[PDB]
Design a protein around this nucleic acid. Structure first.
Lengths: 132, 135, 213, 62, 22, 99
RNA sequence: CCCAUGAACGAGGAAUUCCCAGUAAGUGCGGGUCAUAAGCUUGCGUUGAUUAAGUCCCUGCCCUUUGUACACACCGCCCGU
RNA sequence: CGCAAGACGGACCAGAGCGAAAGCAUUUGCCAAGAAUGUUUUCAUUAAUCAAGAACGAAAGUCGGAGGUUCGAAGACGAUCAGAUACCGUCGUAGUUCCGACCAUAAACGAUGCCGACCGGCGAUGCGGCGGCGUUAUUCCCAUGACCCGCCGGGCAGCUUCCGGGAAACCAAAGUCUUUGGGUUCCGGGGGGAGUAUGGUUGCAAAGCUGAAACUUAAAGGAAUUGACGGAAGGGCACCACC
């Protein structure tokens, strides 16, 4: 079995979180930087950590990572997330509204609006699921 | 023996298959059922009481029945499948499917399959005790 | 040791004229020998033939029992003895969230054929119905049963056996009952469950021959 | 029964008391509209052809 | 012992006492 | 202690329920306590379907169905593995298995 | 170390050890044995396999739910004559 | 294929209904009851619970009559077993069925008296009533029936809640209890001895009701917890398991 242990996974997580900038997509560079920046007493353990580091980097390349969060990239995450459509989806010149909400608005002193268009109510009250 | 008939028409018999849990009967009779053509049971095909209702014994009985009824010209067979009925089990015994498959495979032409096990509107007291069979 | 089938002869069994297919199959009987007459041993026979083997486009879950009323010239002329539904149909209609209304009548035809007719119907769940069950109340059930009995009597006592069978083949009695009971409680699967010949007039060859064509 | 070969298209899994039978979808290269479950014996890969002198029987499935 | 059978045994003793006591 | 709020049956609002017989052992079990199964199957099994279909003297005859009503006493239900013991919390689930 | 004869065995009816690649098996060597002393044992090369990429059928063991009147814990507890 | 007999009313049949409970399931008719609902009807406190007394009371059992299909205590026999006087099998008497008369007991249980008030939510379901789009049977129509959406009252229940309670399990009652009093009946006081003895009383009997003490004993018991175990179920692993 080739399942990574919580020691290797945790160390690789800490390495990505703290030393993201130096870490790259190549395994060998990951191994060298992990040797340089952390005391990893075993070459095999170094290599396991470097492999998980590489896989985690590919995971971030896919996009979001569920198991880690780095603020140095979270700022740019929020930078991308500031998406403003040119025309607001809430500014529709015609809004279909039901007669009951029409009556509610008329009682709300908003019966003189011009964007509202009354809708035909359903002819039946068959909304429940058949029991059984 | 058998009636002369065109080779494209099938003369029908009725195969009452009594699939009990202790024995299986394959009984081909006249369409009216009053005249018996052949009847073979599982116990005429094995020597062990435990195997009287086995699928193999029913298979042997059904093949014997099919051969005998073919030598009298009957080519098609209506099926009346029944369990014990009454108080006892309504589920047919293990030999029902075996007999049906054997009869189909033995060159017989299956007609209409019907289930005729005796169902009461309500019956006498069942053979078991109030607490049933405890073994 | 000697097979008793060497002296058995085969007779064609004919259905009454109300059915499209006349040849319902082949019976057999031992040849006459003194007291044992082949003719007398052929008249008690009952053939339970599916209607689909008696009619062409009709359903197969309705069986008719025909009793061999006379034999002549290797031809066993039968007559209507009764009718039934197959076990599968009866078991398939009885479901667990509906009322089954049953009725029966003892009614004589115009030609003296006393028949016991059984009718079964089931209450029908509506298209928009949310409630799981579709039970009819006791007075509603009694009214539906009364309507079923009146319709069965009306359809039998004013007709003879020929017309009674002719309206049993399409089950027009069940359709009439279902139509008439939709104002009491909508019925779902209405059928004449079983017709049994209670009593029959004494045998006459003329009515048989008029029946066979 | 007519002789008609079938090619493996998917290895469904293992069955049997000791887990020796293998459920596998097999397709006949005559119409590619039939793909029946067959239990097979022995080491079975994906993509071979199984000679079938008998096809009226089906493997337990669903 | 079972309470029902204890009661049955007690009733048997009572029957014996009833018959013996003249 | 009291195991079930419904006492293992469905008898609420009435005093007596007519018994029935277990289809396996013939034990007298109250009707609303007996475990009922409605078996819907074919008189011809799946393996035998093709032989009967190709031995038929009809076309699209369709095989008849068999309709079985089984009533099991609790011991027979448990032995036949149609119901099982459930955890103290899973016991409360009256939802039938999806099947 | 030397010099013919012979018991016995034709794959060993029950019941079954142990076996995932330099593995099983095929043999020789070296130690512990040891004043001489290996059918044992502990290591070693020496030939290379149709077989398995699976399962809970058996044998067990573990876990979960469940019952318990057991807690010395079923080799328990306990009833009656 | 018929005939006869005596039972029994399948499926529909439900955490549905009715009844004081025991109990009650094929049409159909008759008879007399009954809850709930509706009510701008009537009386006007007539009520609640109840020693005494009374009606009913599963099954088994008892006495007499009829019947007697099935099942079936007892009993006979066949198996199993070390032995089985049992479980299992073939029979099979009383009984099981009906009528009359006794018996009055059940884990007769919701192991929870009845009447009244108050205290959450939710979806169902049965009955009655009320209101409402629409669909359907509705033949110039309204009705009414089947649905659909609500509401009200009385029921059988269910889910949920940190109402509160409780040893807890659990209970919307088993809550409104040391912040202890709405009314009232029955009834318990460690475990055995023992529902025994005796007396009385009821019964044809079987037995029912009432019902001790000597003596003996440091626990018996309830709920829940963790283990261990199961001839309980479901998963997983293992060439010291199998294939």
């Amino acid at each position: 079995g080739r399942v990574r242990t919580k020691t290797v996974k945790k160390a690789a997580r800490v390495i990505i979180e703290k030393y993201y900038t130096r870490l790259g997509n190549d395994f060998h560079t990951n191994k060298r930087v992990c040797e340089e920046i952390a005391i990893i007493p075993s070459k095999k353990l170094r290599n396991k950590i470097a492999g998980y580091v590489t896989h985690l980097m590919k995971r971030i390349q896919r996009g979001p990572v569920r198991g880690i969060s780095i603020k140095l990239q979270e700022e740019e995450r929020e930078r991308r997330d500031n998406y403003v459509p040119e025309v607001s989806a809430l500014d529709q010149e015609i809004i279909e509204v039901d007669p009951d909400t029409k009556e509610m608005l008329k009682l709300l002193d908003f019966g003189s609006l011009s964007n509202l268009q009354v809708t035909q109510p359903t002819v039946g009250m068959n909304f429940k699921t058949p029991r059984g | 023996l058998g009636p002369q008939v065109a080779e494209g028409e099938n003369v029908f018999g009725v195969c009452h298959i009594f699939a009990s849990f202790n024995d299986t009967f394959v009984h081909v009779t006249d369409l009216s059922g009053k005249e018996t053509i052949c009847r073979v049971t599982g116990g005429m095909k094995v020597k062990a009481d435990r195997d009287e209702s086995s699928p193999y014994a029913a298979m042997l009985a059904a093949q014997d029945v099919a051969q005998r009824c073919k030598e009298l010209g009957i080519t098609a067979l209506h099926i009346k499948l029944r369990a014990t009925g009454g108080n006892r089990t309504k589920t047919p015994g293990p030999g029902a499917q075996s007999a049906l498959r054997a009869l189909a495979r033995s060159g017989m032409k299956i007609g209409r399959i019907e289930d005729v096990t005796p169902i009461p509107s309500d019956s006498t007291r069942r053979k078991g005790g109030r607490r049933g069979r405890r073994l | 040791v000697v097979d008793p089938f060497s002296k058995k002869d085969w007779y064609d069994v004919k259905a009454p004229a109300m059915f499209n297919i006349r040849n319902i199959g082949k019976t057999l009987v031992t040849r006459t020998q003194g007291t044992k007459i082949a003719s007398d041993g052929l008249k008690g026979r009952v053939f339970e033939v599916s209607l689909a083997d008696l009619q062409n486009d009709e359903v197969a879950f309705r069986k008719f029992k025909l009793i061999t009323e006379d034999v002549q010239g290797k031809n066993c002329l039968t007559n209507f003895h009764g009718m039934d539904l197959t076990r599968d149909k009866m078991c398939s209609m009885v479901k667990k969230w509906q009322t089954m209304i049953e009725a029966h009548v003892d009614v004589k035809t115009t030609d003296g054929y006393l028949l016991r007719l059984f009718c079964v119907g089931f209450t029908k769940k509506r298209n928009n119905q949310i409630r799981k069950t579709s039970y009819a109340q006791h007075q509603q059930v009694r009214q539906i049963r009364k309507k079923m009995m009146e319709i069965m009597t009306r359809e039998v006592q004013t007709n003879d056996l020929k017309e009674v069978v002719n309206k049993l083949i399409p089950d027009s009695i069940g359709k009439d009952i279902e139509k008439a009971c939709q104002s009491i409680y909508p019925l779902h699967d209405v059928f004449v469950r079983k017709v049994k010949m209670l009593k029959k007039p004494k045998f006459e060859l003329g009515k048989l021959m008029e029946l066979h064509g | 029964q007519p002789i008609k070969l079938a090619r493996v298209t998917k290895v469904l899994g293992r069955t049997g008391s000791q887990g020796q039978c293998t459920q596998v979808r097999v397709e006949f290269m005559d119409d590619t509209s039939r793909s029946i479950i067959r239990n097979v014996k022995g080491p079975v890969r994906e993509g071979d052809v199984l000679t079938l002198l008998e096809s009226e029987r089906e493997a337990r499935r669903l | 012992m079972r309470a029902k059978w204890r009661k049955k045994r007690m009733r048997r003793l009572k029957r014996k006492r009833r018959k013996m006591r003249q | 202690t009291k195991k079930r709020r419904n006492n293992g049956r469905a008898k609420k609002g009435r005093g007596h329920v007519q018994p029935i017989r277990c289809t396996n052992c013939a034990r007298c079990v109250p009707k609303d306590k007996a475990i009922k199964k409605f078996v819907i199957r074919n008189i011809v099994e799946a393996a035998a379907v093709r032989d009967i279909s190709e031995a038929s003297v009809f076309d699209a005859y369709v095989l008849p169905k068999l309709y079985v009503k089984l009533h099991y006493c609790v011991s027979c239900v448990i032995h036949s593995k149609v119901v099982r013991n459930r955890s103290r919390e899973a016991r409360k689930d009256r939802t039938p298995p999806p099947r």
